[PDB]
Structures are given as structure tokens and as C-alpha cells.
């Protein structure tokens, strides 16, 4: 639907939609920008992530409200409406995964971009896994795990332990371990070693990078406090 709009105009309008908190519009603009076929800059990747994160975030919150009502009940209306929301959520996840597969990941050669997209791939398979119940749940979980694992391997080889994308990836892989894979010990160990190794690399950072890294370290600490 965005094929007739200039790439730069779609990016400009994505930033306007963020300011207007119009995240569905923001995601459609960034989807159009991706479909121009050019690689995304660091800022453009962040715009893509923020847009779909907010869209799917609202869907996940709604799904959890309805799933909780459905469980308390167990007419067809609650199940029907949970299914409707669930189907829409799955459609958004499939759309993101399709963008990563056609063709963001295969053209991403630098560590920052490749890790960023593999993290996204893990996240959106994780969101699919949150609602999975049929014969595809195990394969969905392994698809999330595999994407996270490849991103972790690259980040550990190519990035410093304080790199924000490396920290956010480790944070989300640890939530995957705790919430999806039923591996809370793995989640705790990952969160602790990530925090400790970042703490030991903070002395190399500027004041601005220091603030960036310690902000995400605090999320690792929040989870460790909740989990232990």
C-alpha cells in the first residue's frame, strides 16, 4: 500500500507517527520502507523495532486479559474473541518475520545489523510461542531459540559486553529461557553473567554510553530480583 510513496517520506512519516503515538501507522510506514529493498540504517532499524514492538505489545496485553477471562470461565464469545485477537497478533508476527526473511537478514553483513535482526526474529517467534498450543509449539520455540542463539554467538564474538544490542538480546533470551523454555536456571545464569561481564566493561565507556548500558543492566537486575 506504500509502494507509491518515497522511501524518505515513509521514514519521515514513521517519525511523525511515533510522535503522535500512532504505532499501527508507524509500522505500516516502516514496512513500506523495508519493501523498498534497501538496507536499513541504525536509526531506521530502531524505528522498525519500536513500531512493531508497540503494535504487538498492545495485542499481547489484550490477549492476556482475554486468556485470563477465558480460563476463569473454563457461551463461545470469550473463546471467539480471544481467537480473533490471537489471529491478529499472529498476523503481525508473521509480517515481521516475513520482512526479516525477505530480505533484511540475508543482506545484513555487519554485526550490529545482523544481531539486531536475529534478536527481532527471536522476539517475534517468542511472541508466537506465547500463544502456541498445537503441534507447532515445539518448532516455534526452537525457531526462537535458534535465532537467539545465532545472535548470541555473533554478539559475543563481535561486540563488547556493554553494547546495548548485546545486552538487550541477552535480556530477551533470558526471558525466553524463563517464560517459554521452562529453564529458569538458564535464565538466571544468563542474566547474571551478562550483568557481571558488562559491569567489568563499564570503565571503557563515555558518560553517554555508560548511561545507555547501565539502563539495560538495571532491567537484568530487576529480573534477577524477581527470579531469586
Amino acid at each position: 500500500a506504500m509502494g507509491s510513496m518515497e522511501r524518505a517520506s515513509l521514514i519521515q512519516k514513521a517519525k511523525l507517527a511515533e510522535q503522535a503515538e500512532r504505532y499501527e501507522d508507524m509500522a505500516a510506514f516502516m514496512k513500506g520502507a523495508v519493501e523498498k529493498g534497501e538496507e536499513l540504517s541504525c536509526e531506521e532499524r530502531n524505528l522498525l523495532s519500536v513500531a512493531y514492538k508497540n503494535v504487538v505489545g498492545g495485542q499481547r496485553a489484550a490477549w492476556r486479559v482475554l486468556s485470563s477471562i477465558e480460563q476463569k470461565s473454563n457461551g463461545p464469545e470469550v473463546r471467539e474473541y480471544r481467537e480473533k485477537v490471537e489471529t491478529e497478533l499472529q498476523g503481525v508476527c508473521d509480517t515481521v518475520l516475513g520482512l526479516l526473511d525477505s530480505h533484511l537478514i540475508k543482506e545484513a553483513g555487519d554485526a550490529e545489523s545482523r544481531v539486531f535482526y536475529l534478536k527481532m526474529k527471536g522476539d517475534y517467534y517468542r511472541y508466537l510461542a506465547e500463544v502456541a498450543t498445537g503441534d507447532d509449539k515445539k518448532r516455534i520455540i526452537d525457531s526462537a531459540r535458534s535465532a537467539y542463539q545465532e545472535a548470541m554467538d555473533i554478539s559475543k564474538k563481535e561486540m563488547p559486553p556493554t553494547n546495548p544490542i548485546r545486552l538487550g538480546l541477552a535480556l530477551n533470551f533470558s526471558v525466553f529461557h524463563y517464560e517459554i523454555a521452562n529453564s529458569p536456571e538458564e535464565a538466571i545464569s544468563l542474566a547474571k553473567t551478562t550483568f557481571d561481564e558488562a559491569m567489568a566493561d563499564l570503565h571503557t565507556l563515555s558518560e553517554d554510553s555508560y548511561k545507555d548500558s547501565t539502563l539495560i543492566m538495571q532491567l537484568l537486575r530487576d529480573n534477577l530480583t524477581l527470579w531469586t
Binding site: 519500536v50 522476539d123 538487550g168 535480556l171 530477551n172 526471558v175 524463563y178 517464560e179 539495560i216 532491567l219 530487576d222 529480573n223 524477581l226 527470579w227
Partner: peptide, 7 residues
């Protein structure tokens, strides 16, 4: 319940 990455 736990925190994944957020702005």
C-alpha cells in the same frame, strides 16, 4: 511478569 527490553 519479567522485563524484556523496553525503551
Amino acid at each position: 511478569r519479567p522485563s524484556s527490553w523496553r525503551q
